Amino acid sequence: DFFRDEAERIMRDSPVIDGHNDLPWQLLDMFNNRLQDERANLTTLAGTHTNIPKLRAGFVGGQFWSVYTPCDTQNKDAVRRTLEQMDVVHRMCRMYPETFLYVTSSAGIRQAFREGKVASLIGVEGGHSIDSSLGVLRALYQLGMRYLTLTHSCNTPWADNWLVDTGDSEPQSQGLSPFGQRVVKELNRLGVLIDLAHVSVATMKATLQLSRAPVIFSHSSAYSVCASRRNVPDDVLRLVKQTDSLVMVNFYNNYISCTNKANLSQVADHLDHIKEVAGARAVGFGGDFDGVPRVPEGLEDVSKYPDLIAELLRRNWTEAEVKGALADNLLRVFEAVEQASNLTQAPEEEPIPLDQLGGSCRTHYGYSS
Amino acid sequence: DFFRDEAERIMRDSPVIDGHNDLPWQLLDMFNNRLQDERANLTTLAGTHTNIPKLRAGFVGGQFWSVYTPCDTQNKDAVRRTLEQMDVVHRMCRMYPETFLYVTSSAGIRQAFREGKVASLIGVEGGHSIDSSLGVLRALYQLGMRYLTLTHSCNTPWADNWLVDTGDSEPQSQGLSPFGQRVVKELNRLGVLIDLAHVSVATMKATLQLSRAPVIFSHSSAYSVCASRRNVPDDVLRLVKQTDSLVMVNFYNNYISCTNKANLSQVADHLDHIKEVAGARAVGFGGDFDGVPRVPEGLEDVSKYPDLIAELLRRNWTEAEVKGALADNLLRVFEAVEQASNLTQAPEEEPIPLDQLGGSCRTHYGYSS
Ligand SMILES: *[C@@H]1O[C@H](CO)[C@@H](O)[C@H](O)[C@H]1NC(C)=O
Ligand SMILES: *[C@@H]1O[C@H](CO)[C@@H](O)[C@H](O)[C@H]1NC(C)=O
Ligand SMILES: *[C@@H]1O[C@H](CO)[C@@H](O)[C@H](O)[C@H]1NC(C)=O
Ligand SMILES: *[C@@H]1O[C@H](CO)[C@@H](O)[C@H](O)[C@H]1NC(C)=O
Ligand SMILES: [Zn+2]
Ligand SMILES: [Zn+2]
Ligand SMILES: [Zn+2]
Ligand SMILES: [Zn+2]
């Protein structure tokens, strides 16, 4: 088709940078992170939405690999598992160097594009990965973390998750607690993209007001099209336009069609809506591949991106608009996050009040007066 | 004084590289790692064995800063606190760049020497810091860990501590378990110095036979002089000689004189013994300043090293011998550990058997149990 051909033509110049793929999670679940297991070979990997040949077929040039540890690891082994997940991403890049180029900056993604490699970054899904520690935060930064999803589907002691909006969770921090605000201040200082997927509206609003840099939704869709609280409402979409932020669209069926069944066209509806309310520069891709049980007809795996782009061209999106959705909006936001960082500025060191630390799996050294 | 002048002349060419200083622990216990606190100013800090002017007076040119988290943090928040202690060391070097040069190699130490800065490295004290994970181990390496003390004063699921030799602990792994052997192999491939301070004799001997590179005792003294199980016995000293390893002398009174009261002359007695049994290239310093309640008369703080060097010269240690004790032996061992590392060798990924993990602060993802 003419649109598919144009899609590929454009994608050769502007490869897609996806904001959220949970392949690392599958590697842990399926092989206990044993990359040498021949069943785990990435050139032939089956049973997942992602593998090397599929990535190449979908013209994927950049990928924020999700370093995710479940909510039940909070106040348990969340920090240990986050390190192991970041480790599996590091090893993956070193194991398939002909394919992946591990990067931690916007300039780095651009170099990957020049080299014909899949720029590979790390996105930490859930603030429970830092265990309310500014020191652990900086450590994750040093290890490659380039975005932090403030919460997953559970509250941290300083940020509220989306389930607060469905009543399944209590509004603990009413957005961001004072420590949570220092976390935003710290993420801003370091140059880490703040990610609002999985958080509550109050947390979305608090962050869009508080952050000194544009923020992202690594894998969130349009609430107007599908009223899932994992999706973004119009008033927030307006804040996204105001701050020049970015919503990277999630392909999960139940967030797209609000039911188990969904198709490629319905994803373009979310894209259209985000483009109309938040603006064309606020649109991106955050498929949630390998993180969801259901993906749309036409978007069975990571090789289907050109078909989604072809559809956007069919709906009259201009080349500039699809190039922005593909990679340029993410790059603009990433560069702004880097410009707004201040590594010379003294790091945030005021800890979270002891009465706010939860669980029965810690000790209280340092805390006294 | 002839020997004090000579000590300084020699120390200006070969400043001391101490193998273990617990200042980070003091920064946590005293200020909860708040380096901006006015009391925490390192140029004026009182109440500790270490601070900037003291380090300069003692001619200290290299230091392995201990990143230590208590034994009771094992199976609790050990990993979290380890990252926080590593973080305070990183921040310390950043806050006083005119004094500390953060380094992670032997060439880096020589660079610090050339610039007149105190080479600042990280020594992780206790295998519980990795919570039996090879991924956390690699993460710590990436964060700057250049030596791992296999155990502190408690057994890990894969190594036995020194208390086993006093009867207070059971010989769980009877040295190193199979996973513990894999840890040692990973430490060798990474280029991390294996530290035998705090381990049982069975662990020292198992590691000495297994390691493919020379090892160290970052802060342990001579068992013949003081029969403390925190000290190294002669048969292990013969293994140290055989492997061209290194024993860095601890200044703690109770490990020196085997009693609360001790003096500089007695520490020199330990150095003499190690030199006799393990050889001159197996001696160094690992004072344990800021990690102990009692230090010898004449060795009150970190500014006292020149007096100890003067005593060794007085005792007829040659210039080559003291330069070895000061810096050259550690540098030799470091270079060997670096040469034994292999970047191309596939990382160890066979996890510890699930049934060997303890505590109630973890989840069993990857295994399923
Ligand atoms: C993956 O498999 C291909 C062939 O199926 C092989 O050529 C390649 O060496 C393998 N890669 C790894 C890392 O095992
Ligand atoms: C499609 O978009 C272009 C902008 O590139 C616009 O000029 C044109 O009118 C649109 N086509 C239709 C049929 O609306
Ligand atoms: C420490 O105090 C001295 C004054 O004694 C001051 O010059 C220096 O800037 C201070 N350093 C920091 C990091 O506060
Ligand atoms: C001191 O050492 C020198 C050279 O190492 C040696 O010749 C001399 O005999 C030693 N002096 C004593 C008193 O042992
Ligand atoms: Zn998610
Ligand atoms: Zn995810
Ligand atoms: Zn110590
Ligand atoms: Zn110690």
B351–A32 C-beta distance less than 8 A: yes
| Beta bridge pairs of residue B194 | B148
Tokens matching residue B39? 């009391």
Please tell me whether residue B148 adopts helix, strand or coil conformation.
strand
Q: Could you give the CA distance from residue B230 to residue B239 in angstroms, rounded to a whole number?
A: 17
Q: Ligand 4 pocket test: which of B316, B321, B322 has the largest number of ligand atoms within 8 Å of its C-beta?
A: B316
Among A26, A34, A81, the strongest candidate for a mutation testing the B interface, having the largest count of B CBs within 10 A, is A81
Which helix (H) or strand (E) covers residue B174, if one does? none
SS3 A295: coil
Residue pair A140/A129 in contact by the 8 Å Cβ criterion: yes
- What letter would DSSP give residue A315? T
**Rounded distance, CA B124 to CA B127, Å?**
8
Is residue A51 within 8 A of residue A45, CB to CB? The reply is yes
HEC string of A243-291 equals: HCCEEEECCCHHHHCCCCCCEHHHHHHHHHHHHHHCCHHHEEECCCECC
Instruction: Identify residue A361 by its one-letter amino acid code.
Output: C
Alpha carbon A295 to its chain centroid, in Å, reads 17
Task: Tell if the CB–CB gap between B28 and A365 is shorter than 8 Å.
Answer: yes
- The answer for B238, left when phi > 0, alpha when psi is -120 to 50, beta otherwise, is alpha
Rounded Cα gap, residues B76 and B362, in angstroms:
9
Q: Is B169 helix (H, G, I), strand (E, B) or coil?
A: coil
Report the distance separating Cα A216 and Cα A336, nearest Å: 12
Q: Is residue B137 classed as helix, strand or coil in its secondary structure?
A: helix
- Residues B203 and A319: their CA atoms lie apart, in Å, by 65
Backbone phi and psi for residue B233, each to the nearest 5 degrees, phi listed first: -75, 160
Residue type at position A59: F
Q: State the amino acid at position B368 in one-letter form.
A: S
Cβ-contact A269, A309 below 8 angstroms: no
Tell me how crowded residue A363 is: count the other CB atoms within 10 A of its CB.
15
Helices B201-210 & B234-243 angle (0-180, nearest 10): 20
Q: Which two tokens stand for residue A39?
A: 């069943």
List of E strands, B280-346: 283-285
Distance (Å) from the alpha carbon of A137 to chain B's nearest alpha carbon: 9
Using the CB atoms, write b or e for A105-123: b if 16+ within 10 Å: bbebbbebbeeebbbbbbb
With CA atoms as reference, report the closest residue to A20 among A248, A234, A337. A248
A43 lines ligand 1 (CB under 6 A): yes
Burial of B287 (C-beta count, 10 Å sphere; 0-12/13-18/19+): buried
A366 touches chain B (CB under 8 A): yes
Whole-angstrom CA distances from A362 to A76, A130, A357, B72, B88 are 9, 14, 9, 9, 19
Provide the β-strand partners of residue B138.
none
Closest CA to A23 of A114, A118, A153: A118
CA B336-B338-B341 angle, 5° bins: 110
Residues in chain A followed by a break, C to N above 2.5 angstroms: none
Atom 3 in ligand 3: which residue has the minimum CA distance?
B43
The residue whose CA is least distant from atom 9 of ligand 4 is B316
State CA B76 to chain mean position distance.
23
CA A275 to chain centre: 19
The torsion angle over the Cα atoms of residues A256, A260, A263 and A266, rounded to 10 degrees, is -30
End-to-end CA distance of chain B: give it in Å, rounded: 68
Q: What is residue A167's DSSP assignment?
A: T
| Burial of B39 (C-beta count, 10 Å sphere; 0-12/13-18/19+) | exposed
The residue to mutate among B37, B38, B41, having the most atoms of ligand 3 within 8 angstroms of its beta carbon, is: B41
How many separate helices (H) and strands (E) can be counted in chain B? 14, 9
Q: Are strands B100-102 and A283-285 parallel, antiparallel or unpaired?
A: unpaired
Helix (H) or strand (E) holding A312: helix A305-314
Question: Distance between CA A368 and CA B197 in Å, rounded?
Answer: 30
The pair of three-digit structure tokens given for residue A144, joined into one six-digit string: 């490659």
CA A299/CA A257 separation, integer angstroms: 14
Q: Which domain holds residue A28?
A: 1-369
Amino acid (one-letter) located at A9: R
Per the entry, the structure determination technique was X-ray
Please give the helix or strand (H or E) that residue A223 lies within, else none.
Answer: none
Burial annotation A72-96 (CB, 10 A radius, 16+ → b, else e): ebbbbbbbbbbbbbbbbbbbbbebb
Rg (CA), chain A: 19
Structural domain count of chain B: 1
| CA–CA separation, A229 and A211 (whole Å) | 22
Residue pair B209/B185 in contact (Cβ under 8 Å)? The answer is no
Q: Probe ligand 2: pick from A316, A318, A322, max atoms within 8 Å of CB?
A: A316
Give the residue from B308, B313, B315 showing the smallest Cα distance to B285: B308
User: Is B270 a known active-site residue?
Assistant: no
CB atoms within 10 A of CB A2: 9
- Nearest Cβ partner for A363 among B73, B79, B91: B73
Å from CA of A346 to ligand 3 middle: 14
Ligand 6 center to residue B186 CA distance, Å?
Answer: 30
How do A16-21 and B100-102 pair as beta strands?
unpaired
Query: Is the minimum CB–CB distance between A131 and chain B shorter than 8 Å?
Result: yes
Q: How far is the C-alpha of A63 from the C-alpha of A59, rounded, in Å?
A: 11
Here the CATH number for the domain that contains residue A162 is 3.20.20.140
Report d(CA A98, CA A116) in Å as an integer: 9
- DSSP per-residue string spanning B7-50: HHHHHTTS-EEEEEE-HHHHHHHHHTT-TTSGGG-TTT--SSS-
Nearest CA to ligand 4 atom 11: B316
- Which 3 state secondary structure label does DSSP give B96? coil
Q: Is B96 on the interface with A (CB under 8 A)?
A: no
Locate the DSSP E strands across chain A. 16-21, 60-67, 100-102, 118-125, 145-149, 193-195, 216-217, 246-249, 283-285
- For residue A214, give both structure tokens: 């544009």
| CA gap A54, A44 in Å, rounded | 10
Q: How far is the CA of A300 from the centre of ligand 8 (A)?
A: 55
d(CA B173, CA A255): 51
In contact, B50 and B21? CB cutoff 8 Å: yes
Distance of alpha carbon A324 from alpha carbon A351, whole angstroms: 39
Residues 6+ apart with CB under 8 A from B29: A365, A366
- Cβ separation of A80 and B35 shorter than 8 Å? no
Tell whether A14 is within 8 A of chain B (Cβ).
no
Among B309, B341, B333, CA closest to B9: B309
Q: Cβ neighbours of residue A112 under 8 Å, at least 6 residues apart?
A: A61, A62, A101, A103, A118, A119, A120
Query: How is B219-269 classified by DSSP, letter by letter?
Result: T--BTTTS--TTSBPHHHHHHHHHHT-EEEE---HHHHTSSS--BHHHHHH
- φ/ψ of B63, rounded to 5, equals -155, 130
**Tokens standing for A241?**
């336009």
Q: Which atom of ligand 2 is nearest to the CA of A318?
A: 5
Of B86, B136, B349, the CB nearest to A36: B349
List the structure tokens of B114. Answer: 């050339």
Rounded distance between C-alpha atoms, residue A60 and residue A171, angstroms: 38
Tokens of residue B249, six digits:
């002398």
* SS3 call for A237: helix
| Residues whose CB is less than 8 angstroms from the CB of residue B227 and which lie 6 or more positions away in sequence, other chains included | B258
**Closest listed residue to residue B85, CA positions, set B22, B155, B39:** B22
Catalytic-role residue among B49, B128, B219, B270: B219
Nearest Cα to Cα of residue A190 among A210, A212, A173: A212
What is the number of CB-based contacts under 8 A between chain A and chain B? 132
Resolution in A: 2.0
Where helices occur in A284-352 by DSSP H, the ranges are: 305-314, 319-323, 329-339
Put simply, the answer to whether A36 touches B77 (Cβ < 8 Å) is no
**Cα–Cα distance for residue pair B219/B19, rounded to 1 Å:** 7
Instruction: Give the rounded distance of the alpha carbon of B152 from its chain centre.
Output: 11
DSSP element (H, E) containing A76: none
Q: Which residue has 């979305």 as its token pair?
A: A204
DSSP letter string, B108-136: HHHHHHHHT-EEEEEEEE-GGGGTT-HHH
Give, using CA atoms, the residue closest to atom 4 of ligand 2.
Answer: A318
Query: Measured between alpha carbons, how far is B359 from A92 in angstroms, rounded to an integer?
Result: 30
- Residue B248: φ, ψ to 5°: -95, 110
Query: Which residues have CB under 8 Å from B260's CB, separation 6+?
Result: B253, B254, B294
Question: Quick one: which of B181, B299, B200, B198 has its CA closest to B251?
Answer: B299
